[PDB]
Design a protein around this ligand. Structure first.
Ligand SMILES: CC1=C(CC[C@H](C)CO[C@@H]2O[C@H](CO)[C@@H](O)[C@H](O)[C@H]2O)O[C@H]2C[C@@H]3[C@H]4CC[C@]5(C)C[C@@H](O)CC[C@]5(C)[C@H]4CC[C@]3(C)[C@@H]12
Ligand SMILES: *[C@@H]1O[C@H](CO)[C@@H](O)[C@H](O)[C@H]1NC(C)=O
Lengths: 69, 335, 127, 205, 46
């Protein structure tokens, strides 16, 4: 369970720094990122870049499932 | 059944083996009587100090069946032509996503989609919104956010098709199997050991003892019996044939035939050529099946932390480069 | 040859290649031949100070059925010394013919082929 | 109709029982992907025991040599007569000739010494070998005592060392992504989109 | 006979899971298509 938690923490921190220095919240950004990382719709010059990894990582997880399958 | 009379020196014991099998086959091929004596002095009866097993003297014996190897000093006194193993030698990350020049279609399709967007803002005020839609849509369906809908429909069609193709490709990737010769030593490493991984001192062994000081002549017979090595798995070299025999028996052991780093009768004349011809004529057919049947006889993987190192293959490359690019534009456009 | 070409080996030492004459019609070709077997022959000669030579071979009882082999029979008939180059056959017949020395190497027999490959049939189908 | 079409194709661009309909969507998508996985899942003699080598074959070629040694080795086994029959049409002057001939794939396979084929494949990084040695096996006239010396000559560990040095001297020398036809699919799809857009502009005015 | 004869005959003389695709996919997805579609039609119509 290390990769998920560490990556979500890193994403929360990076989005927090993106918002903070461009807004002068942290918890709201963290919640939005947590939702984004988990394939739901319950939830800007470079944010899309982050979105990128999401897709592939999900595939990777599923891939291992198939490898397990 | 198939045993042979057998004595050592008034008691007889059951006695038979592959050596016995070949001996009896040869005798039948030649119809020669015989006596199956046994060792009495030493484990090999070698001429240690000018005193093989039965031929330590000049003509003490009248045969030679010792499975031990064939040497120069042993051979130079009595011819010992024979076939056997010779006991010479002993003990997805980068290709994850895809090939680069395959999804060039995706770049060109991005450009055409942008152009189609250019073809829609005068047909029924949204460029930055359209730009975000395009950019966030370029990826898989998971996204936070009548040609107008038809273009999106075809877009989603080949997007999901590409995703399914990626699923098939990764299914092929994950289906994979898995499991060093330079010299007699461990891949050009020091003569003996850097004193780590000590071993290969069985006290045959004398053959490498006289080699170019045999690991500093640091062999105090630590090995003792070969089976003693059973504990020594991952806490060694020896006659390769017997090593393979033990391997056949789990205990994965260095088994290299190509290495073969270290590579049967009395001196009595009028016996070499006969048996040599007999074997060269008949052996070639029967002998291999005979040995393997009589005696001398994996892609599975479940899971591990290998998944962590595996996804590390496609994690840092994106995260760190994204951080670098983002920070480069963070402290650059702001002035 | 031009006389044999001289070239340092991979390790740097010269790779010996001695003048070797034989058939490539009837024209004698004095080419230059080399190989590990040649080096082994050199080692042997240095061991017993031989005065060696070489000769390539022509090829690899009603009228003629027995005396037709190239290597062993050719060597025996042509008067060439007991030295032979390649292991080729190692059997009982060639053994009884002249002799077989201790095996310089232990080998067997195998097969070489062309490795296959190409996915197709998307069937994402015409239906 | 547009909303339903969008719903059926996994996008968000788009009521007592409507959810029931939604149901089928899910499973059908899975089914489609399942078949893709079913499509995704798929796939030589590798020994004398292969029936093609044993049984006669018009296509597969069990190439042979010019009655050098293999002929003798096979005449021992009577069952190889048919193979020996093919040997009648598969005897060539040199092994190099057979290698060159099979480089074009005209002859399916050739049987020869392990070492020769091994190191040639080492040189020939374009072909594939089977290994699996099955018939593990210098001459002289019977009048030269030098024989003993020769044997004595090679018996040395300093001699096996020279053999190993020669070995060093000489032996030194599956994504298959569908992509292409997938490319064609995407190109024809964009062509369909272009014609649909031409129709949309036609209906526009 | 009991020992040699079988190998003798088979060697001397007297001597598959692969599937790609077809319209079998249509009959296959019909397995889980009608059951939902028609039952949903009835459940809605009632
Ligand atoms: C779809 C896309 C890929 C796919 C490649 C993968 C992400 C992985 O990266 C690939 O790895 C392979 C394996 O090592 C290597 O062989 C390849 O060299 C490497 O490209 O490239 C991305 C780079 C680009 C971004 C970067 C910013 C700019 C260049 C300019 C800015 O003004 C805004 C626009 C633009 C063009 C921006 C838009 C998207 C994009 C074209 C991106
Ligand atoms: C070397 O060979 C020559 C042959 O002409 C012989 O006379 C000489 O004794 C040999 N020397 C040794 C040391 O064997």
């Amino acid at each position: 369970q290390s990769t998920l938690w560490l990556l979500v923490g890193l994403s929360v921190h990076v989005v927090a720094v993106m918002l903070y220095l461009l807004d002068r919240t942290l918890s709201s950004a963290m919640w939005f990122s947590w939702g984004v990382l988990l394939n739901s719709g319950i939830g800007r010059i470079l944010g899309m870049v982050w979105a990128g990894f999401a897709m592939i990582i999900v595939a990777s997880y599923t891939a291992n499932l198939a490898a397990f399958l | 059944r198939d045993s042979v009379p057998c004595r050592s020196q008034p008691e007889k014991r059951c006695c038979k083996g592959f050596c016995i099998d070949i001996l009896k086959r040869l005798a039948h091929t030649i119809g020669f009587s015989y006596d199956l004596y046994l060792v009495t002095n030493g484990k090999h009866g070698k001429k240690i100090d000018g005193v093989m097993i039965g031929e330590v003297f000049y003509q003490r014996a009248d045969m030679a069946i010792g499975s031990l190897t064939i040497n120069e000093e042993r051979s130079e006194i009595v011819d010992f032509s024979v076939p056997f193993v010779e006991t010479g030698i002993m003990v997805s990350a980068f290709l994850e996503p895809y090939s680069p020049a395959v999804w060039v279609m995706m770049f060109v399709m991005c450009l055409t989609v942008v152009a189609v967007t250019v073809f829609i803002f005068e047909y029924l005020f949204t460029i930055g919104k359209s730009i975000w839609l395009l950019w966030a849509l370029v990826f898989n369906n998971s996204v936070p956010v009548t040609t107008s809908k038809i273009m999106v429909l075809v877009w989603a069609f080949f997007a999901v098709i590409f995703l399914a193709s990626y699923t098939a490709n990764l299914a092929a990737f994950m289906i994979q199997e898995e499991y060093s010769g330079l010299s007699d030593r461990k891949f050009q490493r020091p003569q003996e050991q850097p004193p780590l991984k000590f071993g290969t001192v069985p006290n045959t062994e004398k053959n490498i003892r006289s080699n170019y000081h045999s690991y500093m002549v640091r062999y105090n017979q630590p090995r003792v019996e070969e089976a003693l090595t059973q504990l020594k798995a991952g806490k060694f070299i020896y006659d390769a044939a017997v090593l393979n025999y033990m391997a056949r028996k789990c205990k994965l052991v260095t088994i290299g035939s190509g290495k073969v780093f270290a590579t049967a009768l009395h001196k009595g004349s009028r016996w070499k050529r006969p048996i040599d011809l007999a074997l060269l004529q008949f052996l070639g057919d029967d002998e291999i099946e005979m040995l393997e049947r009589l005696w001398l006889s994996d892609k599975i993987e479940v899971m591990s932390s290998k998944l962590d190192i595996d996804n590390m293959a496609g994690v840092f490359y994106m995260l760190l480069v994204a951080m670098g690019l983002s920070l480069l534009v963070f402290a650059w456009e702001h002035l | 040859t031009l006389t044999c070409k001289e070239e340092f080996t991979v390790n740097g030492d010269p790779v010996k290649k001695v003048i070797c004459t034989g058939p490539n019609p009837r024209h004698t070709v004095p080419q230059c031949c080399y190989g590990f077997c040649i080096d082994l022959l050199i080692k042997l000669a240095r061991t017993m100070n031989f005065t060696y030579e070489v000769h390539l071979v022509a090829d690899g009882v009603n009228n003629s059925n027995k005396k037709e082999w190239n290597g062993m029979m050719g060597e025996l008939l042509s008067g060439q010394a007991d030295m032979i180059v390649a292991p080729l056959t190692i059997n009982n017949e060639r053994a009884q013919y002249i002799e077989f020395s201790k095996p310089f190497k232990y080998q067997g027999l195998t097969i070489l082929v062309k490795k296959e490959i190409r996915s197709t049939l998307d069937s994402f189908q015409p239906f | 109709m547009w909303f339903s079409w969008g719903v059926l194709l996994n996008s968000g661009i788009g009521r007592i029982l409507g959810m029931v309909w939604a149901g089928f969507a899910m499973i059908i998508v899975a089914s489609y992907t399942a078949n893709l996985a079913a499509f995704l899942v798929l796939d030589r003699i590798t020994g004398i025991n292969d029936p093609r080598l044993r049984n006669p074959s018009d296509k597969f070629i069990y190439a042979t040599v010019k009655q050098s040694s293999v002929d003798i080795y096979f005449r021992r086994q009577v069952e190889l007569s048919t193979m020996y029959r093919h040997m009648e049409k598969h005897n060539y002057e040199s092994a190099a000739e057979a290698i060159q001939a099979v480089r074009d794939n005209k002859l399916h396979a050739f049987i020869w010494d392990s070492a020769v084929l091994e190191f040639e494949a080492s040189q020939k990084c374009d072909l594939v070998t089977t290994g699996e040695l099955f018939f593990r096996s210098i001459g002289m006239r019977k009048d030269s005592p030098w024989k003993q010396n020769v044997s004595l000559s090679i018996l040395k560990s300093h001699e096996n060392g020279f053999m190993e040095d020669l070995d060093k001297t000489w032996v030194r020398y599956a994504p298959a992504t569908l992509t292409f036809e997938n490319m064609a699919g995407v190109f024809m799809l964009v062509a369909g989109g272009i014609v649909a857009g031409i129709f949309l502009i036609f209906i526009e005015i």
